[PDB]
Design an enzyme around this catalytic site. Structure first.
Site, PDB file in Angstrom:
ATOM      1  N   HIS A  78      -1.739 -14.407 -56.765  1.00  0.00           N
ATOM      2  CA  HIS A  78      -1.763 -13.240 -55.701  1.00  0.00           C
ATOM      3  C   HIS A  78      -0.674 -13.779 -54.732  1.00  0.00           C
ATOM      4  O   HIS A  78      -0.907 -14.726 -54.120  1.00  0.00           O
ATOM      5  CB  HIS A  78      -2.906 -13.001 -55.037  1.00  0.00           C
ATOM      6  CG  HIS A  78      -3.574 -14.157 -54.445  1.00  0.00           C
ATOM      7  ND1 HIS A  78      -4.585 -14.955 -55.229  1.00  0.00           N
ATOM      8  CD2 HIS A  78      -3.781 -14.396 -53.141  1.00  0.00           C
ATOM      9  CE1 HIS A  78      -5.015 -15.826 -54.409  1.00  0.00           C
ATOM     10  NE2 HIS A  78      -4.787 -15.282 -53.152  1.00  0.00           N
TER      11      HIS A  78
HETATM   12  C1  LIG Z   1      -3.890 -14.582 -63.315  1.00  0.00           C
HETATM   13  C2  LIG Z   1      -4.091 -13.512 -61.991  1.00  0.00           C
HETATM   14  C3  LIG Z   1      -4.931 -13.916 -61.250  1.00  0.00           C
HETATM   15  C4  LIG Z   1      -5.580 -12.902 -60.266  1.00  0.00           C
HETATM   16  N1  LIG Z   1      -6.311 -13.189 -59.535  1.00  0.00           N
HETATM   17  C5  LIG Z   1      -6.535 -12.131 -58.410  1.00  0.00           C
HETATM   18  C6  LIG Z   1      -7.782 -12.318 -57.551  1.00  0.00           C
HETATM   19  O1  LIG Z   1      -8.409 -13.532 -57.639  1.00  0.00           O
HETATM   20  N2  LIG Z   1      -7.799 -11.385 -56.518  1.00  0.00           N
HETATM   21  C7  LIG Z   1      -7.500 -10.250 -56.522  1.00  0.00           C
HETATM   22  O2  LIG Z   1      -7.467  -9.520 -55.607  1.00  0.00           O
HETATM   23  N3  LIG Z   1      -6.363 -10.174 -57.646  1.00  0.00           N
HETATM   24  C8  LIG Z   1      -5.642 -10.938 -58.247  1.00  0.00           C
HETATM   25  N4  LIG Z   1      -4.820 -10.695 -59.280  1.00  0.00           N
HETATM   26  C9  LIG Z   1      -4.321  -9.475 -59.036  1.00  0.00           C
HETATM   27  C10 LIG Z   1      -2.933  -9.811 -58.371  1.00  0.00           C
HETATM   28  O3  LIG Z   1      -3.162  -9.895 -57.063  1.00  0.00           O
HETATM   29  C11 LIG Z   1      -1.850  -8.139 -58.470  1.00  0.00           C
HETATM   30  O4  LIG Z   1      -2.364  -7.547 -59.787  1.00  0.00           O
HETATM   31  C12 LIG Z   1      -0.591  -8.093 -58.194  1.00  0.00           C
HETATM   32  O5  LIG Z   1      -0.426  -8.593 -56.806  1.00  0.00           O
HETATM   33  C13 LIG Z   1       0.046  -6.702 -58.180  1.00  0.00           C
HETATM   34  O6  LIG Z   1       1.354  -6.826 -58.553  1.00  0.00           O
HETATM   35  P1  LIG Z   1       1.929  -5.610 -59.772  1.00  0.00           P
HETATM   36  O7  LIG Z   1       1.171  -5.651 -60.999  1.00  0.00           O
HETATM   37  O8  LIG Z   1       1.466  -4.158 -59.011  1.00  0.00           O
HETATM   38  O9  LIG Z   1       3.518  -5.733 -59.748  1.00  0.00           O
HETATM   39  P2  LIG Z   1       4.218  -4.881 -60.752  1.00  0.00           P
HETATM   40  O10 LIG Z   1       3.876  -3.217 -60.688  1.00  0.00           O
HETATM   41  O11 LIG Z   1       4.516  -5.383 -62.045  1.00  0.00           O
HETATM   42  O12 LIG Z   1       5.838  -4.825 -60.032  1.00  0.00           O
HETATM   43  C14 LIG Z   1       6.891  -3.922 -60.583  1.00  0.00           C
HETATM   44  C15 LIG Z   1       7.980  -3.958 -59.759  1.00  0.00           C
HETATM   45  O13 LIG Z   1       8.826  -5.109 -60.041  1.00  0.00           O
HETATM   46  C16 LIG Z   1      10.175  -4.345 -60.184  1.00  0.00           C
HETATM   47  N5  LIG Z   1      11.192  -5.358 -60.881  1.00  0.00           N
HETATM   48  C17 LIG Z   1      10.567  -6.273 -61.938  1.00  0.00           C
HETATM   49  N6  LIG Z   1      11.673  -6.876 -62.310  1.00  0.00           N
HETATM   50  C18 LIG Z   1      12.876  -6.476 -61.729  1.00  0.00           C
HETATM   51  C19 LIG Z   1      13.998  -6.939 -61.614  1.00  0.00           C
HETATM   52  N7  LIG Z   1      14.515  -7.843 -62.432  1.00  0.00           N
HETATM   53  N8  LIG Z   1      14.890  -6.602 -60.743  1.00  0.00           N
HETATM   54  C20 LIG Z   1      14.448  -5.366 -59.945  1.00  0.00           C
HETATM   55  N9  LIG Z   1      13.322  -5.146 -59.668  1.00  0.00           N
HETATM   56  C21 LIG Z   1      12.359  -5.675 -60.685  1.00  0.00           C
HETATM   57  C22 LIG Z   1      10.166  -3.037 -60.372  1.00  0.00           C
HETATM   58  O14 LIG Z   1      11.252  -2.444 -60.367  1.00  0.00           O
HETATM   59  C23 LIG Z   1       8.811  -2.565 -59.867  1.00  0.00           C
HETATM   60  O15 LIG Z   1       9.206  -2.156 -58.434  1.00  0.00           O
HETATM   61  C24 LIG Z   1      -4.632 -11.736 -60.074  1.00  0.00           C
HETATM   62  C25 LIG Z   1      -3.571 -11.422 -61.110  1.00  0.00           C
HETATM   63  C26 LIG Z   1      -3.496 -12.305 -62.038  1.00  0.00           C
HETATM   64  C27 LIG Z   1      -2.183 -12.328 -63.240  1.00  0.00           C
END
Ligand SMILES: Cc1cc2nc3c(=O)[nH]c(=O)nc-3n(C[C@H](O)[C@H](O)[C@H](O)COP(=O)(O)OP(=O)(O)OC[C@H]3O[C@@H](n4cnc5c(N)ncnc54)[C@H](O)[C@@H]3O)c2cc1C
Ligand code: HEC
Ligand code: HEC
Ligand code: HEC
Ligand code: F3S
Lengths: 537, 97, 418, 45
Positions: free
Chosen positions: A473
């Site tokens: 995170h």
């Molecule tokens: C192993 C693991 C443990 C976790 N543990 C916890 C926990 O303990 N507690 C908790 O609350 N949460 C936890 N989480 C959740 C995590 O905190 C959230 O899921 C995360 O912060 C959310 O990100 P997202 O998936 O929304 O990003 P995404 O939606 O995947 O981001 C997409 C964005 O990236 C941009 N982008 C990507 N590639 C490019 C590029 N090449 N150029 C330009 N832009 C680009 C896209 O345009 C878009 O804007 C965990 C997650 C994982 C995987």
């Protein structure tokens, strides 16, 4: 492409914000770099994923890595994320890209921060406190908890923790043998074990099945008992929003008034397209949003979009964890229930936080069958003896983490380096992550406590990692504050310099805190929804 | 050339039941791995009635897919699926099957 | 509880008069799917202005039994008043006391029913029931059978209106007395045959299993889904054990009605083992979605929470309507405030959406290896279930084009006579 | 002023727009009208 409010990044933050906005009526377009991904395909990949990557936790191999905008994987890496510094391994965190975001995989741990953490600078004089207080976000905490369907220990008083104006929508599902044994042994030792509020359905909720203990919360759940961003994305798309996959936003055309007018994004085949909407919102990641802001530098803003104070990329935080692995003298039988059920929250608050970080002890409840099986296989035993060896190693296998609170340091940065490129030429983000003596002393204390726990449980073959482990995170990178000249975003999820740009992501987060807390990112994203409203009402 | 691999090691040092045709998938994959895979396996029957007081590489068909003598050692205590009240005081302790 | 309260619970009266669980009970405003369109239940709380507070024993019975409203309009056949026709007047008057005294009136309106021509005119339904010969002398206690069968006939035919959901219809959308409790499509779902037929009905069910199924909806060989989930969680689960036992005794005396070529009972049909080679694959795609809650061999859970897909009445039917509706919508039952749920897998699914071609692929696989191998699912068979089943022949006339074509035909006759 | 739609070309492929009279050249329509004539005969009785 024309819209009313454009949200980039269809993860937890983007999808929840889009769902709330389309509920309010005004049209919202979701643009994400990742493709449209289904849960069943990830379940099939994980089942067919080589099991050697199950022994050591891998949360990116089942998820396909699109060539144009790859998501980082930490079994031998594709070098999407570059980490530098003495504790570069602390920021060895992984993300998954696509509709649903990194929220496609997560331990479902949703938490409410302590009231002291919101005034951390005003309490202990370290870091930057949040712009708002606990009371200014608690209703949004409850709203996000209701939307995602969090669990919670309603009928028990635990410890100094977050006070609640309304108990959790569910009730904590009962412990397995492992959690009960861990709780009793730590209580005998002197540590208080507390159930973790999880975004898991202890009872059927929002048309999703009850948690059946698949023990595969990370990196994909076969049934959907835990919450994912794909749920909010689908709800928003059904309610009227338009979502487009493979939208890699890279540049934003701004004016002299600092109000953005256009956004351009690449498809996999470099075709750029312009989209115009009244209000532009970016919710990517604490690692992707600052990178996108730095990449989109235009004539008006040379060093980055909305950077009149130049704090983007700086003050990156991610909880440093101390791992553990050994075999208990008595059969813990860890594996029952969800992957993360209990934790030691007794050390989450105190007067010692002014000198070292508040430790968060708590073990991992993931099944040990694969790791123990391959350990026994590596012992070279075959046959019945191998059977008793695998039995012992999967009945005594224990894994413990110990998170910490890392403070905002401006020395950290998110330089998008030019040495390594991608398919679209977008520079690969590079993070210089420094820890500081604060978390050094905190980690020494955590190591002492982990030795205490191992000695209490009669651990054998103790292998604690000699380096701080990540927690996936991303906290901070675009810090809040009342003063525009020392902080980049304001109290209402708005960039100070760009008034027409609302930012709501873990980059906006101000203090790392103690616990695994994407819920606060959900709360702040829902907080920004009202900002959308009054801006267009 | 399939039943020999099915009964290669023993009934006790392996599965009493069948492999559910995963051995056919395993054997067809081993063809690209080792040309002499089909030649050594047949000779192994006579030696038990040299090969593995000294030669261990013959265990690659025994290590591999985990198949740690697999549907597991204890499938009745840990998941991979089961009923929601999975907690039943750890079921057994060390009763293999 | 009140005597009228028992009948109101038994007669499923609260099921159709509340919009799900959120709306107030007996307040109306609940949409029910019909081939002609959507008929909205009107408020029933005794409100003097917007309810039925002005109703009296003479006209409340007429609306309940003979289905005419206070104004004089004919109530839509969606009411089981044809089933309620045999309801005894000594019991109907008990309902009137319950309505006026127990439920709290609400001064809240409900949306009105709107249907295309010729269903727009309400008085046209008066002719409809005459061809359906509803009347229908009030039920008198039978003498040739014991007292238990007497109450069993009371609950099924007229009280719980089990017939109106099970027994088929005709071109005029009326109950078919020849094929009594034979099983026919109900919008998207399909009630199965529940006659005493051993191989084609529910006769092969053990009597203890049948009593348990109607009490809760959960048995090792069958689980109540769809409309039965609403039927059980609302009405039957609150019934006394003797009444449910009375239902079982009556269901054993209904004459058998065999189907078109059935050889073995639906729940007695075993399944063959199979696996998948570790999109568009029956074995593989079923494993990516179903292999967790059920097992890879279809045997389900060890104790019985998840259903065993082998020897299951939902999979053992020749018509795969229940199985396709199970995938497209999922099951959601609630016994004694303990909810069990199965996620929907339709286009609007929240967990994982399967297209119509995809649903057919699993349906073909599960029927081939766990259900009746005779059954087969086409690509468009799932599409019909999504739209609400096959269009009834009468519903084709509910289009502005058809009536215009028939309108000219009537004009032709008038000039022809001249 | 002229503008071409996507389905405008499709009509040309099939042989232009269907004339109103041609709709009666389908077995379904005549059956619907056949019952209407039956209605008149019983109506007079
Ligand atoms: C192993 C693991 C443990 C976790 N543990 C916890 C926990 O303990 N507690 C908790 O609350 N949460 C936890 N989480 C959740 C995590 O905190 C959230 O899921 C995360 O912060 C959310 O990100 P997202 O998936 O929304 O990003 P995404 O939606 O995947 O981001 C997409 C964005 O990236 C941009 N982008 C990507 N590639 C490019 C590029 N090449 N150029 C330009 N832009 C680009 C896209 O345009 C878009 O804007 C965990 C997650 C994982 C995987
Ligand atoms: C769902 C299948 C229903 C159940 C069970 C019961 N009723 Fe009903 N009722 C229903 C509809 C859809 C309608 C209106 C359609 C029409 O043809 O107009 C009605 C109508 C009534 C009325 C008429 C007055 C009113 O304001 O609607 C009454 C008095 C009435 N229904 C009573 C009633 C009682 C007492 C029931 C329990 C036995 C009952 N209904 C069951 C739908 C359904
Ligand atoms: C767990 C989350 C499930 C998944 C994934 C699937 N099904 Fe399911 N199904 C589940 C339950 C808990 C139940 C019954 C309710 C109970 O209390 O027993 C069912 C029911 C069915 C049925 C009908 C059984 C009955 O009603 O007698 C069928 C035909 C069925 N399920 C099929 C099915 C298929 C094909 C699935 C893959 C798409 C699938 N289910 C997923 C739980 C779960
Ligand atoms: C309409 C709302 C119904 C009423 C009233 C009753 N039943 Fe029903 N029943 C209904 C459906 C749609 C289904 C099938 C669900 C599915 O899995 O497809 C059923 C099922 C049964 C069964 C199971 C038989 C089998 O699956 O072969 C039985 C034994 C049964 N129903 C009995 C029953 C009785 C006794 C009722 C009066 C109280 C009754 N049903 C009412 C729909 C409806
Ligand atoms: S994914 Fe689902 S059912 Fe239980 S352990 Fe993990 S939650």
């Amino acid at each position: 492409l024309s819209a009313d409010v454009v949200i980039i990044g269809a993860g937890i933050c983007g999808s929840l914000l889009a769902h709330k906005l389309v509920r309010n009526g005004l049209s919202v377009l979701l643009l994400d770099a990742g493709p449209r991904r289904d849960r069943s395909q990830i379940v099939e990949n994980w089942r067919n994923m080589p099991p050697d990557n199950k022994s050591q936790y891998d949360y990116a191999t089942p998820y396909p890595s699109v060539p144009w905008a790859p998501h980082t994987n930490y079994f031998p890496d594709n070098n999407y994320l570059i980490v530098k510094g003495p504790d570069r391994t602390a920021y060895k965190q992984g993300i998954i890209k696509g509709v649903g975001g990194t929220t496609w995989h997560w331990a479902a741990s949703s938490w409410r921060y302590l009231p002291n953490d919101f005034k951390l600078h005003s309490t202990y004089g370290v870091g930057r406190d949040y712009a708002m207080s606990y009371d200014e976000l608690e209703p949004y905490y409850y709203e996000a908890e209701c939307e995602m369907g969090v669990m919670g220990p309603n009928g028990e008083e635990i410890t100094p923790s977050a006070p609640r104006q309304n108990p959790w929508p569910m009730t904590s599902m009962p412990y397995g043998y492992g959690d009960r044994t861990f709780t009793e042994i730590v209580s005998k030792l002197g540590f208080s074990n507390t159930p973790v509020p999880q975004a898991r359905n202890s009872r059927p909720y929002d048309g999703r099945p009850q948690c059946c203990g698949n023990n595969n919360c990370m990196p994909i759940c076969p049934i959907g008992a835990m919450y994912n961003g794909v749920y909010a994305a689908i709800k928003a798309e059904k309610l009227g929003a338009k979502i487009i996959p493979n939208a890699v936003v890279y540049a934003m055309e701004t004016d002299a008034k600092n109000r953005i007018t256009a956004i351009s994004f690449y498809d996999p085949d470099k075709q750029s397209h312009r989209v115009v909407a009244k209000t532009f919102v970016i919710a990517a990641n604490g690692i992707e949003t600052p990178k996108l802001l730095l990449l989109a530098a235009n004539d008006r803003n040379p060093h980055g979009i909305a950077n009149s104070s130049d704090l983007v990329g700086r003050n990156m935080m991610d909880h440093p964890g101390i791992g553990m692995s050994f075999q208990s003298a008595e059969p813990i039988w860890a594996g029952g229930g969800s992957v993360q059920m209990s934790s030691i929250t007794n050390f989450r608050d105190g007067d010692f936080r002014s000198e070292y970080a508040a430790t968060q002890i708590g073990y991992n409840n993931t099944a040990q069958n694969s790791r123990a099986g391959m350990k026994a296989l590596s012992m070279g035993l075959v046959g019945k003896k191998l059977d008793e060896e695998i039995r012992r190693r999967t009945a005594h296998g224990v894994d413990i983490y110990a998170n910490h609170e890392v403070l905002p340091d401006p020395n950290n940065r998110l330089v998008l380096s030019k040495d390594y490129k991608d398919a679209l030429g977008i520079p690969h983000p590079e993070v210089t992550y420094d820890v500081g003596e604060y978390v050094r002393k905190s980690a020494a204390i955590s190591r002492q406590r982990l030795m205490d726990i191992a000695k209490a449980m009669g651990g054998t073959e103790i292998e604690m990692t000699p380096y701080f482990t990540p927690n996936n995170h991303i906290t901070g990178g675009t810090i809040m504050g009342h003063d525009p000249r020392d902080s980049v975003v304001d109290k209402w999820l708005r960039t100070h310099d760009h008034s027409n740009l609302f930012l709501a992501t873990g980059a906006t987060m101000a203090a790392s805190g103690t616990v695994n807390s994407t819920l606060t990112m959900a709360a702040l994203s829902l907080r920004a929804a009202d900002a959308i409203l009054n801006d267009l009402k | 050339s399939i039943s020999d691999f099915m009964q290669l090691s023993a009934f006790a040092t392996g599965h009493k039941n069948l492999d559910l045709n995963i051995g056919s998938a395993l054997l067809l994959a081993f063809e690209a791995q080792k040309h002499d895979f089909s030649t050594q396996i047949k000779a192994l029957r006579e030696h038990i009635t040299p090969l593995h007081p000294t030669l261990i590489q013959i265990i690659r068909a025994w290590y591999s897919v985990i198949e740690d003598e697999t549907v597991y050692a204890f499938e009745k205590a840990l998941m991979y699926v089961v009923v929601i009240p999975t907690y039943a005081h750890n079921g057994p302790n060390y009763w293999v099957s | 509880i009140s005597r009228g309260h028992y009948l109101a619970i038994a007669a499923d009266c609260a099921a159709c008069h509340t919009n799900g669980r959120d709306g107030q009970f007996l307040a109306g405003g609940y949409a029910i799917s019909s081939p002609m369109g959507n008929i909205y239940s009107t408020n029933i709380t005794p409100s003097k202005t917007h309810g039925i507070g002005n109703y009296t024993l003479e006209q409340f019975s007429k609306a309940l039994r003979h289905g005419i409203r206070a104004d004089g309009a004919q109530l839509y056949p969606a009411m089981p008043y044809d089933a309620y026709n045999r309801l005894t007047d000594e019991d109907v008057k008990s309902l009137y006391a319950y309505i006026m005294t127990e439920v709290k009136p609400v001064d809240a309106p409900s949306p009105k029913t709107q249907l295309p021509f010729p269903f727009s005119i309400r008085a046209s339904l008066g002719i409809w029931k005459i061809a359906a010969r509803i009347e229908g002398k009030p039920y008198v206690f039978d003498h040739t059978h014991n007292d238990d069968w007497n109450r069993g006939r009371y609950l099924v035919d007229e009280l719980a209106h089990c017939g109106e959901c099970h027994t088929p219809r005709n071109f005029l959308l009326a109950p078919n007395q020849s094929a009594y409790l034979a099983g026919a499509d109900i919008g998207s779902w399909r009630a199965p045959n529940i006659t005493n037929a051993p191989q084609s009905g529910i006769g092969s069910w053990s009597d203890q299993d049948l009593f348990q199924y109607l009490k809760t909806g959960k048995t090792a060989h069958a689980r109540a889904a769809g409309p039965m989930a609403e039927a059980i969680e609302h009405s039957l689960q609150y019934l006394p054990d003797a009444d449910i036992s009375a239902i079982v005794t009556y269901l054993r005396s209904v004459p058998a009605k065999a189907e078109s070529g059935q050889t073995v009972a639906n729940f007695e049909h075993a399944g063959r083992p199979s696996s998948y080679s570790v999109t568009t694959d029956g074995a593989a795609l079923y494993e990516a979605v179903c292999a967790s809650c059920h097992q890879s061999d279809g045997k389900g859970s060890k104790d019985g929470y998840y259903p065993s897909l082998v020897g299951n009445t939902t999979t053992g039917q020749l018509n795969p309507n229940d199985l396709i509706a199970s995938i497209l919508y999922g099951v959601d039952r609630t016994t004694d405030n303990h909810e069990i749920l199965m996620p929907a897998f339709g286009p609007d699914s929240l967990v994982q959406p399967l297209t119509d071609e995809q649903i057919a692929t699993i349906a073909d696989y599960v029927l081939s290896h766990f259900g009746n191998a005779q059954a087969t699912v086409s690509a468009d068979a799932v599409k019909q279930v999504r739209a609400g089943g096959k269009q009834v022949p009468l519903a084709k006339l509910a289009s502005p084009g058809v009536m215009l074509l028939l309108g000219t035909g009537g004009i032709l006759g008038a000039i022809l006579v001249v």
